[PDB]
């Protein structure tokens, strides 16, 4: 009884991890042949222009041509802007871009890492401290927004009671109405917002949104009224998706116990 | 009722805060002393090449800048690299997106890619949080086994035995299974374990057996950074009290002072 549920436990976790390799390998297979042609066309044609850029200056140095521009790539990943024409420049770690980093860091959302060793060891601690100190504000705010749903919908849940109400099946058109509210508010009008400042596309509004909120992975700069705003909305949003990626969790383990009875039948009546 | 919550919001922009004015101290000054020497560099570059010129330095960082969406290229990439997106470097792209470690320099540039990632994230995170809390408790009992070992004050011995035996094994082994610097071996565990990502894989110009390390280290770090909301749990309501008293005592104090 001790040991005897955790050999059943060591199996259910191993046969986990085969449907992540799988879905790795998936995923895998379907980036490969959604992004390696649209890489061969961009390679393919930034060779002709080496190739023109030679010919169209042969006095410059061909070998060390390509080492100009690795050390500029090597020299990107720093505050980088180089050339004799906006040699001016504005700081990556002033009053608010490192307010930003900062914000990053707690977050765990994530081109532009500290150098300094003071910096790299400070941030170590600062992540290991401030990550679970960002915890408590993400879970305050997520029963924060827990309430503002759960009394938002005691009434919605009250507006359609007629006779031959059924208390099971109302659980879920509570459940579309905070994906709808939530997709609405979280999703679809800060990425309406972004085409008006940094004229992105329809997708990559949500793209950048999806990724950002679940602390995968910017439209913060214009070259002060409207980002300490927005920093409201992601940790709104963040807590959002907590819930949102959590929620997935309850289906998942629902079709995992559904596919789980599914074969059980299939191979035992066969 | 009471909220609690609008509290620690004003803990974390304090923290926040004390973040940027430190990253911006730590920071800034190397920030000038980069970019105030590669102007020299490039300033060299016009003068050791008139060939090249004032206009064309300009069109060839604007080539650079293009060719930052695609990444490093002809013979700088054909001497030292092979192509991204083959058979297991997608395949590594494709863990950091469940994992939310998100590296993400080469992120997806088709827009079907970028929809079937929004998809591929938001069913593949919780699929792999099972993993994830699945290996969490694994390792719970291989710790649990070995506690029980070790307990045959002394409550304190062992958290340091946890503290220490793991991240031994967890910053040592993993940064070089994926010489080096002492520093950066864990400045690159804690920003890759921790999910903030993953900080700059290098190619040295100038996968089955790892990613088991890297799942049961994030289960490593998932709780490490659990202990400290446990102890940070702790250090509030031992600083709550503190207060507390020394609000009461000075309340108390104010009341001898009328007579
Ligand atoms: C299993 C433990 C192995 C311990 C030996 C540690 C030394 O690693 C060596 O680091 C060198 C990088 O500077 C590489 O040149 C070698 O290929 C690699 O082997
Ligand atoms: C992209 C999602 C792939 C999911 C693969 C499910 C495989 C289920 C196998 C069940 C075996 C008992
Ligand atoms: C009421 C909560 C305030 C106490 C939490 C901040 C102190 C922990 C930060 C790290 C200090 C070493
Ligand atoms: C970085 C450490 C910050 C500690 C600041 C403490 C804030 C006062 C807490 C009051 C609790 C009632
Ligand atoms: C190598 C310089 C180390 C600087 C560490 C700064 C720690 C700040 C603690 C408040
Ligand atoms: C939605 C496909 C994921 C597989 C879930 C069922 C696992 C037994
Ligand atoms: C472009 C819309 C994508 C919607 C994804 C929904 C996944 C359940
Ligand atoms: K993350
Ligand atoms: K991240």
Redesign the interface.
Same mark, same amino acid.
């Given at each position: 009884s001790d040991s005897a549920i955790?050999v059943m @436990?060591?199996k259910?976790?191993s046969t986990? &991890?085969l449907? /992540?390799v799988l879905?790795?390998?998936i995923? $895998?297979? /379907? &980036? @490969?042949a959604?992004?390696?042609p649209?890489?061969?066309s *961009?390679?393919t044609t930034? /060779?002709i #222009?080496?190739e023109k &850029?030679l010919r169209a200056?042969? !006095?410059?140095?061909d070998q060390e041509l390509?080492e100009?521009? #690795? #050390?500029?790539? $090597?020299?990107?990943? $720093?505050?980088?802007i180089?050339?004799?024409?906006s +040699?001016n *420049?504005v700081?990556?770690? =002033?009053?608010?871009s490192?307010?930003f980093? $900062?914000?990053? /860091?707690?977050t765990?959302?994530?081109?532009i +890492?500290?150098?300094?060793?003071?910096? @790299?060891?400070? !941030?170590?601690i600062?992540?290991?401290?401030?990550?679970?100190? &960002?915890?408590?504000?993400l879970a305050?705010?997520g =029963? *924060?927004l827990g309430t503002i749903f759960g009394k938002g919908i005691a009434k919605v849940e009250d507006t359609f009671i007629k006779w031959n109400v059924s208390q099971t099946k109302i659980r879920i058109i509570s459940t579309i109405i905070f994906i709808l509210f939530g997709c609405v508010l979280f999703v679809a009008l800060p990425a309406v917002i972004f085409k008006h400042i940094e004229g992105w596309s329809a997708?990559?509004a949500?793209?950048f949104v999806?990724?950002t909120l679940?602390?995968?992975?910017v439209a913060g700069g214009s070259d002060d009224f409207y980002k300490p705003v927005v920093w409201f909305w992601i940790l709104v949003g963040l807590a959002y998706f907590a819930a949102?990626?959590?929620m997935?969790?309850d289906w998942?383990?629902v079709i995992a116990k559904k596919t789980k009875e599914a074969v059980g039948e299939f191979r035992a009546h066969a």
């Open positions: 955790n @436990k060591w259910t976790v986990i &991890f449907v /992540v879905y790795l390998i995923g $895998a297979t /379907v &980036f @490969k959604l992004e390696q649209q890489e061969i *961009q390679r930034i /060779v #222009q080496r &850029f200056h042969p !006095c410059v140095s390509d100009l521009i #690795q #050390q500029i790539v $090597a020299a990107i990943n $720093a505050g980088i180089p050339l004799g024409a +040699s *420049q700081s990556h770690w =002033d009053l608010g490192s307010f980093f $900062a914000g990053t /860091v707690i765990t959302i994530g081109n +890492s500290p150098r300094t060793e003071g910096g @790299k060891i400070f !941030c170590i600062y992540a290991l401290l401030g990550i679970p100190l &960002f915890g408590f504000l305050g705010v =029963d *924060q997708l990559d949500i793209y999806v990724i679940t602390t995968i992975g949102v990626l959590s997935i969790g998942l383990r």
